Amino acid sequence: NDPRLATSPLKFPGKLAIDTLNNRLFISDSNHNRIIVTDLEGNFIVQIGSSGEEGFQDGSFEDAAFNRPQGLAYNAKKNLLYVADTENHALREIDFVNERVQTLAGNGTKGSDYQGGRKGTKQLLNSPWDVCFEPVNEKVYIAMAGQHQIWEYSVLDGITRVFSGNGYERNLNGSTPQTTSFAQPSGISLGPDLKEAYIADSESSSIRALDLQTGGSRLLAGGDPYFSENLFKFGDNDGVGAEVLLQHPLGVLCANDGQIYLTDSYNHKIKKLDPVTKRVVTLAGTGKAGFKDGKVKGAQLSEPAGLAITENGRLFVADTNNSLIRYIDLNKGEDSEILTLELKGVQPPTP
Ligand code: NA
Numbered sequence: 001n002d003p004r005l006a007t008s009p010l011k012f013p014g015k016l017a018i019d020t021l022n023n024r025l026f027i028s029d030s031n032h033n034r035i036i037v038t039d040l041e042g043n044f045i046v047q048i049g050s051s052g053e054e055g056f057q058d059g060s061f062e063d064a065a066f067n068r069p070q071g072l073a074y075n076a077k078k079n080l081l082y083v084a085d086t087e088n089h090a091l092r093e094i095d096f097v098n099e100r101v102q103t104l105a106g107n108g109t110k111g112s113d114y115q116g117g118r119k120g121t122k123q124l125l126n127s128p129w130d131v132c133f134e135p136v137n138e139k140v141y142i143a144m145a146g147q148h149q150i151w152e153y154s155v156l157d158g159i160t161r162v163f164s165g166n167g168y169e170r171n172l173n174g175s176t177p178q179t180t181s182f183a184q185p186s187g188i189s190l191g192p193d194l195k196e197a198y199i200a201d202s203e204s205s206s207i208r209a210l211d212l213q214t215g216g217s218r219l220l221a222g223g224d225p226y227f228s229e230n231l232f233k234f235g236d237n238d239g240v241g242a243e244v245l246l247q248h249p250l251g252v253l254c255a256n257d258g259q260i261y262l263t264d265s266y267n268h269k270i271k272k273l274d275p276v277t278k279r280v281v282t283l284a285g286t287g288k289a290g291f292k293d294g295k296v297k298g299a300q301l302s303e304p305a306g307l308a309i310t311e312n313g314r315l316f317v318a319d320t321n322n323s324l325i326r327y328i329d330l331n332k333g334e335d336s337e338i339l340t341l342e343l344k345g346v347q348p349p350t351p
Contacts (some may be wrong), residue, residue: 002291009348010323011029011030012030015030016028017074017308020310024039024045025037026072027325028071028072028306033049033055033065033067034349035048035066036346038343038345040314042343043343051065053349054066054087056108058092060100070086070129070130071129073132074133079097080094080095081096082094085106086145089108089127090103091103091106091128091160104160107124110124110126114149115161117160125146125151129187130185130187135194136194138154138156139152139153140153141163141212143185143187145184149167149182150163150164150165150197150199150210164177169181169182169203170204171201171224171230173216173218173219175214176215182204183203185200185202186250186251187199187249187252187306188200188252189260191258192257195213196209197210198252200250200263202265205223205246205248206221207221208220221244221246222244235247236267240278240280247267250304251305252307253315254275259273261283261315263305265305269282269286270284270315270317270328271283286299286300289302289303289321291319293337294337299337299338301322303321313330316341325343
């Protein structure tokens with residue numbers, strides 16, 4: 001209903017990443033098949049995918065093409081942005097020093113390889129949805145939503161292989177990669193000790209912690225902790241551990257203080273999960289899909305999916321179905337509000 005929604009330059013942005021060294025915000029503008037780089041205030045810097053048209057082309061920023069990208073991760077040391085180019089079934093790399101877009105894995109077509117281990121474009125994928133970058137070991141962890149697996153790309157050898165999950169669509173939290181299953185994982189974010197990676201397990205409606213040394217995982221909140229086959233213990237309920245009900249969370253972000261932020265996407269809320277107490281509170285949203293800013297208990301979102309955070313504590317949200325990027329300044333409990341962040345200089349894909 002609002003005038004801001006009519007005039008958005010984004011169409012259904014899926015995810016977000018942030019460069020805190022250089023005050024840059026990366027927006028995956030999924031349904032325009034492009035990446036937008038703005039400053040932390042929404043002012044435009046540069047575009048990757050100017051056509052707006054679904055395609056699969058490497059090269060310079062103006063030649064390059066994506067197909068419904070979602071997840072973005074930032075390599076600070078090398079000034080690179082990893083892209084989960086979902087409907088190209090590829091992992092792609094935006095090079096900001098060389099103004100080049102390169103493909104790191106995948107070949108354009110959906111694979112059936114549940115094991116992997118090939119190099120570069122010879123290794124196929126299946127709807128990669130989110131990524132994160134482990135900086136000491138130079139690994140990209142991939143949420144393969146299409147095979148219910150977490151995969152691992154090594155920067156050093158160019159190998160993409162399965163990292164965890166046997167491929168059955170289940171909420172199964174074992175202690176090895178084979179004895180673990182995922183259910184449409186769509187968000188991954190590393191804890192601050194780099195030993196765990198928190199998982200937004202969408203079709204189980206759970207948040208899970210993948211062990212980066214063993215390959216097993218722990219159930220944190222949401223889902224049925226008893227029957228790995230029940231992908232229906234979903235709902236909307238705050239609490240601790242098994243009390244918690246979520247519905248199809250698509251995004252997750254771990255902050256440096258260890259606190260986990262998530263998008264309870266089909267509940268149109270944004271929740272915070274404490275990794276020690278397993279307590280989940282609601283940070284913003286009512287439960288009704290729509291657009292409204294202000295204080296968070298009255299405020300509204302529409303299928304949010306992606307988060308990024310500054311170190312002064314500003315939490316940006318890809319309010320996907322509203323096609324807006326929003327933000328909340330955390331830890332102002334009585335005064336907490338969700339604002340819409342206008343973007344200046346950002347315009348639709350030119351014909
Ligand atoms: Na991510």
